Design an enzyme around this catalytic site. Sequence first.
Site, PDB file in Angstrom:
ATOM      1  N   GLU A  58      -9.186   0.618   9.017  1.00 52.74           N
ATOM      2  CA  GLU A  58      -9.410   0.541   7.748  1.00 52.74           C
ATOM      3  C   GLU A  58      -9.278  -0.940   7.324  1.00 52.74           C
ATOM      4  OE1 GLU A  58     -10.430   0.873   3.879  1.00 52.74           O
ATOM      5  OE2 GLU A  58      -8.273   0.176   4.369  1.00 52.74           O
ATOM      6  N   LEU A  97       0.791  -1.289  -0.066  1.00 52.40           N
ATOM      7  CA  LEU A  97       0.200   0.066   0.116  1.00 52.40           C
ATOM      8  C   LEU A  97       0.847   1.378   0.068  1.00 52.40           C
ATOM      9  CD1 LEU A  97      -2.722  -0.907   2.628  1.00 52.40           C
ATOM     10  CD2 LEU A  97      -2.531  -1.505   0.274  1.00 52.40           C
TER      11      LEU A  97
HETATM   12  N1  LIG Z   1      -5.439  -0.090  -1.907  1.00 55.51           N
HETATM   13  C1  LIG Z   1      -6.137  -1.170  -2.236  1.00 55.51           C
HETATM   14  O1  LIG Z   1      -7.507  -1.179  -2.024  1.00 55.51           O
HETATM   15  C2  LIG Z   1      -5.151  -2.299  -2.749  1.00 55.51           C
HETATM   16  C3  LIG Z   1      -3.983  -2.101  -3.252  1.00 55.51           C
HETATM   17  N2  LIG Z   1      -3.452  -3.092  -3.860  1.00 55.51           N
HETATM   18  C4  LIG Z   1      -2.020  -2.870  -4.284  1.00 55.51           C
HETATM   19  O2  LIG Z   1      -2.148  -2.965  -5.619  1.00 55.51           O
HETATM   20  C5  LIG Z   1      -0.635  -3.565  -5.985  1.00 55.51           C
HETATM   21  C6  LIG Z   1      -0.982  -4.850  -7.079  1.00 55.51           C
HETATM   22  O3  LIG Z   1      -2.092  -4.494  -7.861  1.00 55.51           O
HETATM   23  P1  LIG Z   1      -1.748  -4.616  -9.644  1.00 55.51           P
HETATM   24  O4  LIG Z   1      -0.354  -4.178  -9.793  1.00 55.51           O
HETATM   25  O5  LIG Z   1      -2.987  -4.048 -10.086  1.00 55.51           O
HETATM   26  O6  LIG Z   1      -1.682  -6.389  -9.812  1.00 55.51           O
HETATM   27  P2  LIG Z   1      -2.901  -7.389  -9.667  1.00 55.51           P
HETATM   28  O7  LIG Z   1      -3.207  -7.805  -8.413  1.00 55.51           O
HETATM   29  O8  LIG Z   1      -4.089  -6.927 -10.384  1.00 55.51           O
HETATM   30  O9  LIG Z   1      -2.127  -8.602 -10.474  1.00 55.51           O
HETATM   31  C7  LIG Z   1      -2.011  -8.477 -11.911  1.00 55.51           C
HETATM   32  C8  LIG Z   1      -2.001  -9.763 -12.417  1.00 55.51           C
HETATM   33  O10 LIG Z   1      -3.042 -10.407 -12.335  1.00 55.51           O
HETATM   34  C9  LIG Z   1      -3.463 -11.185 -13.454  1.00 55.51           C
HETATM   35  N3  LIG Z   1      -4.947 -10.571 -13.696  1.00 55.51           N
HETATM   36  C10 LIG Z   1      -5.289  -8.955 -13.360  1.00 55.51           C
HETATM   37  N4  LIG Z   1      -6.438  -8.767 -13.681  1.00 55.51           N
HETATM   38  C11 LIG Z   1      -6.922  -9.771 -14.496  1.00 55.51           C
HETATM   39  C12 LIG Z   1      -8.053 -10.037 -15.366  1.00 55.51           C
HETATM   40  N5  LIG Z   1      -9.152  -9.213 -15.328  1.00 55.51           N
HETATM   41  N6  LIG Z   1      -8.430 -11.209 -15.771  1.00 55.51           N
HETATM   42  C13 LIG Z   1      -7.360 -12.410 -15.731  1.00 55.51           C
HETATM   43  N7  LIG Z   1      -6.417 -12.181 -15.027  1.00 55.51           N
HETATM   44  C14 LIG Z   1      -5.938 -10.750 -14.421  1.00 55.51           C
HETATM   45  C15 LIG Z   1      -2.883 -11.151 -14.301  1.00 55.51           C
HETATM   46  O11 LIG Z   1      -1.840 -12.159 -14.033  1.00 55.51           O
HETATM   47  P3  LIG Z   1      -0.900 -12.835 -15.378  1.00 55.51           P
HETATM   48  O12 LIG Z   1       0.356 -11.988 -15.629  1.00 55.51           O
HETATM   49  O13 LIG Z   1      -0.280 -14.186 -14.736  1.00 55.51           O
HETATM   50  O14 LIG Z   1      -1.832 -13.088 -16.455  1.00 55.51           O
HETATM   51  C16 LIG Z   1      -1.947  -9.737 -14.152  1.00 55.51           C
HETATM   52  O15 LIG Z   1      -0.575  -9.801 -14.384  1.00 55.51           O
HETATM   53  C17 LIG Z   1       0.081  -4.165  -4.936  1.00 55.51           C
HETATM   54  O16 LIG Z   1       0.927  -2.890  -4.661  1.00 55.51           O
HETATM   55  C18 LIG Z   1      -1.166  -3.979  -3.801  1.00 55.51           C
HETATM   56  O17 LIG Z   1      -0.617  -3.824  -2.593  1.00 55.51           O
HETATM   57  C19 LIG Z   1      -4.233  -4.240  -4.506  1.00 55.51           C
HETATM   58  C20 LIG Z   1      -5.450  -4.648  -3.947  1.00 55.51           C
HETATM   59  C21 LIG Z   1      -6.304  -3.613  -3.324  1.00 55.51           C
HETATM   60  C1  LIG Z   2      -6.295  -1.917   3.781  1.00 54.00           C
HETATM   61  C2  LIG Z   2      -6.292  -2.462   2.370  1.00 54.00           C
HETATM   62  C3  LIG Z   2      -7.718  -2.262   1.770  1.00 54.00           C
HETATM   63  N1  LIG Z   2      -8.675  -1.501   2.131  1.00 54.00           N
HETATM   64  C4  LIG Z   2      -9.924  -1.555   1.522  1.00 54.00           C
HETATM   65  N2  LIG Z   2     -10.918  -0.603   2.005  1.00 54.00           N
HETATM   66  N3  LIG Z   2      -9.979  -2.170   0.482  1.00 54.00           N
HETATM   67  C5  LIG Z   2      -8.806  -2.883  -0.382  1.00 54.00           C
HETATM   68  N4  LIG Z   2      -8.942  -3.620  -1.523  1.00 54.00           N
HETATM   69  C6  LIG Z   2      -7.755  -2.991   0.455  1.00 54.00           C
HETATM   70  C7  LIG Z   2      -6.637  -3.766   0.156  1.00 54.00           C
HETATM   71  C8  LIG Z   2      -5.845  -4.386  -0.219  1.00 54.00           C
HETATM   72  C9  LIG Z   2      -4.358  -5.334  -0.567  1.00 54.00           C
HETATM   73  C10 LIG Z   2      -4.782  -6.601  -0.042  1.00 54.00           C
HETATM   74  C11 LIG Z   2      -5.718  -7.243  -0.598  1.00 54.00           C
HETATM   75  C12 LIG Z   2      -5.911  -8.622  -0.116  1.00 54.00           C
HETATM   76  C13 LIG Z   2      -5.307  -8.872   1.091  1.00 54.00           C
HETATM   77  C14 LIG Z   2      -4.657  -7.975   1.811  1.00 54.00           C
HETATM   78  C15 LIG Z   2      -3.958  -8.610   3.030  1.00 54.00           C
HETATM   79  C16 LIG Z   2      -2.819  -7.642   3.204  1.00 54.00           C
HETATM   80  N5  LIG Z   2      -1.905  -8.221   4.455  1.00 54.00           N
HETATM   81  C17 LIG Z   2      -2.657  -9.047   5.045  1.00 54.00           C
HETATM   82  N6  LIG Z   2      -3.651  -9.900   4.739  1.00 54.00           N
HETATM   83  C18 LIG Z   2      -4.527  -9.586   3.732  1.00 54.00           C
HETATM   84  C19 LIG Z   2      -4.280  -6.841   1.137  1.00 54.00           C
END
Ligand SMILES: NC(=O)C1=CN([C@@H]2O[C@H](COP(=O)(O)OP(=O)(O)OC[C@H]3O[C@@H](n4cnc5c(N)ncnc54)[C@H](OP(=O)(O)O)[C@@H]3O)[C@@H](O)[C@H]2O)C=CC1
Ligand SMILES: CCc1nc(N)nc(N)c1C#CCc1cccc(-c2cncnc2)c1
Length: 186
Positions: A30, A22
């Site tokens: 959160e 993050l």
């Molecule tokens: N702030 C938040 O709410 C959250 C933050 N994050 C952060 O974001 C970062 C990771 O996210 P991001 O970089 O977008 O990577 P993703 O988690 O989306 O992973 C990308 C990979 O997932 C697969 N993929 C993604 N979308 C699809 C799809 N629509 N259909 C099929 N396969 C798919 C592909 O794998 P392949 O190459 O094998 O085909 C792609 O290379 C991290 O830093 C994480 O901490 C993540 C979730 C929530």
């Molecule tokens: C605080 C992260 C967060 N808040 C909200 N409202 N939505 C989200 N998607 C996320 C997120 C994220 C990245 C993520 C996705 C799935 C699991 C976790 C995770 C990270 N560390 C320990 N357990 C789960 C972290």
Amino acid sequence: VGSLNCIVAVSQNMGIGKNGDLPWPPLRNEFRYFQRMTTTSSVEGKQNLVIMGKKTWFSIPEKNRPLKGRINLVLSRELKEPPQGAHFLSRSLDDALKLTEQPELANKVDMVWIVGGSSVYKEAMNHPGHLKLFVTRIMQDFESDTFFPEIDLEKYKLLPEYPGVLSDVQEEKGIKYKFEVYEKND
Ligand SMILES: NC(=O)C1=CN([C@@H]2O[C@H](COP(=O)(O)OP(=O)(O)OC[C@H]3O[C@@H](n4cnc5c(N)ncnc54)[C@H](OP(=O)(O)O)[C@@H]3O)[C@@H](O)[C@H]2O)C=CC1
Ligand SMILES: CCc1nc(N)nc(N)c1C#CCc1cccc(-c2cncnc2)c1
Ligand SMILES: [Cl-]
Ligand SMILES: [Cl-]
Ligand SMILES: [Cl-]
Ligand SMILES: [Cl-]
Ligand SMILES: [Cl-]
Ligand SMILES: [Mg+2]
Ligand SMILES: [Mg+2]
Ligand SMILES: [Mg+2]
């Protein structure tokens, strides 16, 4: 499945990720909100399904994988089997949803939650039918390398209040944020 949920936390400059984690320091409440929303099932005997990208999966510490109390599904076009610890693997969101209709998952899944990352959100938010977006607005800029696209208000409406979701501005570790809920029906 007749509804989908996306849950995301986003900075003021649309950032969700930085260097595989993050962009902001850990916000405990959160995170608990994220846990509560994704884990809570309204049906006895069923668990919610979480769907995530491959990078997001590996962004989770090994000791916390798979996410407890939830069925963990990972999306990838490259993997041929789920990564160790994950319960399922699909090549697309549509394939994942279909899998829920198969004998293994029938009557096992309550709610479906998409938890990122970017491309997963983009696909999910354009998926037909009812969809709720749970968006935490981190109310300041953070350095990011992974982003959340702006929400199409032609499709989605911001709900003014929502049951089970706090409306007022929250603050943890000096960082202010707000819980928002968006919804489309079609
Ligand atoms: N702030 C938040 O709410 C959250 C933050 N994050 C952060 O974001 C970062 C990771 O996210 P991001 O970089 O977008 O990577 P993703 O988690 O989306 O992973 C990308 C990979 O997932 C697969 N993929 C993604 N979308 C699809 C799809 N629509 N259909 C099929 N396969 C798919 C592909 O794998 P392949 O190459 O094998 O085909 C792609 O290379 C991290 O830093 C994480 O901490 C993540 C979730 C929530
Ligand atoms: C605080 C992260 C967060 N808040 C909200 N409202 N939505 C989200 N998607 C996320 C997120 C994220 C990245 C993520 C996705 C799935 C699991 C976790 C995770 C990270 N560390 C320990 N357990 C789960 C972290
Ligand atoms: Cl809490
Ligand atoms: Cl969790
Ligand atoms: Cl129910
Ligand atoms: Cl307050
Ligand atoms: Cl504070
Ligand atoms: Mg409100
Ligand atoms: Mg307020
Ligand atoms: Mg409050």
